[PDB]
Amino acid sequence: SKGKLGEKISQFKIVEELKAKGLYAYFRPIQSKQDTEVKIDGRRVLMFGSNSYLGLTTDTRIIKAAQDALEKYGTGCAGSRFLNGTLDIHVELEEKLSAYVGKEAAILFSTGFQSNLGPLSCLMGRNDYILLDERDHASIIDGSRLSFSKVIKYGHNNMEDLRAKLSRLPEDSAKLICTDGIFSMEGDIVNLPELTSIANEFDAAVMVDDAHSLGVIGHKGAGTASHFGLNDDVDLIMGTFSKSLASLGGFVAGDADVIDFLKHNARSVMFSASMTPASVASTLKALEIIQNEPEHIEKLWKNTDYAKAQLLDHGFDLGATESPILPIFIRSNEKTFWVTKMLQDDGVFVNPVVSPAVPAEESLIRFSLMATHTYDQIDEAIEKMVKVFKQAEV
């Protein structure tokens, strides 16, 4: 029955207002591959809003690997990994990821989101604590809320605040610190050296979410611990397959004993169907390409360095990025919606960040690079972004 339910959704007017103003730019149906240009309503649009940092969702070797796994294994596993849903290829991908990030063992999950729900829900319990950077990804906060522990947020990359909050806690309690590696809103990197120095002083577990780091930072893209040399100070390396690795799913890697506990105790793997064969095979082939062909990472960074220089040279106000995520400040929700829509209509796809995710005065568009971008495409998008920022009076 719908009386109270209708009242619960009654105040949510922003979508109807964006649509009626002709500003609504969400859920655009793309008609093509995710690539440097996409097709929407039959036309071509430059894509600067993707997480496919290495451009690999169009790699024919990865497409064929997935098609071959469909041929051999079919469309789905139709069960949980612990029962009837494990394939030989899931185990192969766990062994290959463990080798890649330098850990004993790994467990896959069917999404990146569920990869954070698993360890955050089941390791810390009653009388224990989870410490979260306040800018951590939504799946980390949600995973931590599914624990029976006390969740404490600390200021963004604020090591004095982390240390102070750890200092207040009972000695006879377990603690876990969970952080994004690269944070996707400003593209900044966690202070892993100081965070792990603090974790060691308080004997806190460390988990790093490398969604935006794998294929981006670290030796051969192996992530944030690799970038800092701190593999031995990080208990759990989490990653996703939905960004550089061109697929869907994620993993948690760490010591065999911890991984054995997770794979039998995390509800998000015990009670959810396993990755499809096609996604396992595409992740395996993408992982082989990222390591064997260094050109993908190198050009991602050539594009990132070029576009960042060009944006700063044209006088854009950039956030404190250290990654291929170039946050461009607009500082008005209304201008951010207007710029986003006018750019889409003019052939450029960027992603808006608006209230209530951020304050109006910090509203921005995210311009993300892919290894497959050309300097001509970057130049075309920046020319159009100068024109639209002119029209919008930013």
Next chain:
Amino acid sequence: SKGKLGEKISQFKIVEELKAKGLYAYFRPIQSKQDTEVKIDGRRVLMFGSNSYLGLTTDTRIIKAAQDALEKYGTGCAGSRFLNGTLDIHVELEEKLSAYVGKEAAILFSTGFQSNLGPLSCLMGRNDYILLDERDHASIIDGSRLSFSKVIKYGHNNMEDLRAKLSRLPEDSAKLICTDGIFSMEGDIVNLPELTSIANEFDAAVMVDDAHSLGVIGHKGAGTASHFGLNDDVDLIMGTFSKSLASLGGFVAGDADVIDFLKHNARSVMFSASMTPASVASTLKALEIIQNEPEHIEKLWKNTDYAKAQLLDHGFDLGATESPILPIFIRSNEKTFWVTKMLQDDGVFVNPVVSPAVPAEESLIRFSLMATHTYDQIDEAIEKMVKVFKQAEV
């Protein structure tokens, strides 16, 4: 750092004990398609532990649809639906599911699990209530824990308990009742007529999880509301693609206004990458086959009725199933592990249910049918289950 973390996992000994006793039967790597027989360590095993109720993960039309979508759309969308991760085919599948279950609109999620997290986390808030059957799936409890509401469990299919608990709540509060349609542990059906009569008297929203119901009950498999004629008394129909539909993902269907609110407010869709093209295409083709070819559902039920009769005739103790899930009571955790392993070694795959999921005295194995099972395969598995139950002294 690992001192307290090592202490947190120290008491978890059951897996090391099962392995050392030679009883461990979990995470078996299958080397073939999910089918009526699977290959494990090179040998052939009858599969009676699957959720693929219609046998469709091997349908060449569904395999080819997925391979064609890889060819056209690549391996992944690399973003959230609201940004750069919507395809025309996602929208097509939402419109087709809305038509199938008889609702205005639908929103996909990348897993069934995340399909429950979405509506349960974001509709009821502070000062509101979620009412859950105590046997609801883990993803429903977890979704409800991610709300800011008060979560109340009621006794399993206990309508007097549901009504009593609703009666205690403030009138000036929203309420939502969430139930599995078919419950997977005993295979029983929710009392939807009485639950919806109570919901109407208290103006509570109703959500049904039809993971095990789609392709199983209802007209052309359209689920639990369809089975009872109660579409107009159910606000939200949730389903998964990982069972009859042979794929990965799920959806929530309902009124356009409610679905518009969810798709913009559910963290599990705002902050998680969209279904891969291959999985969208396989779900679309499976959905077309389930409706157009009635033989799949009919034979699922011919197999279910045959196997249930044969189990009862051989004197097995069955749970209160109304579905293709045939729960066989063993009532000893040690016998359940032993029977499960001896059956696997002898060529039969069933799924154990043990403490702490259930009391020792209610421990059981689940024997599930698929439309593609033959009566000969059913007979072979029951012959082997009689032999192993003899050896185990059940």
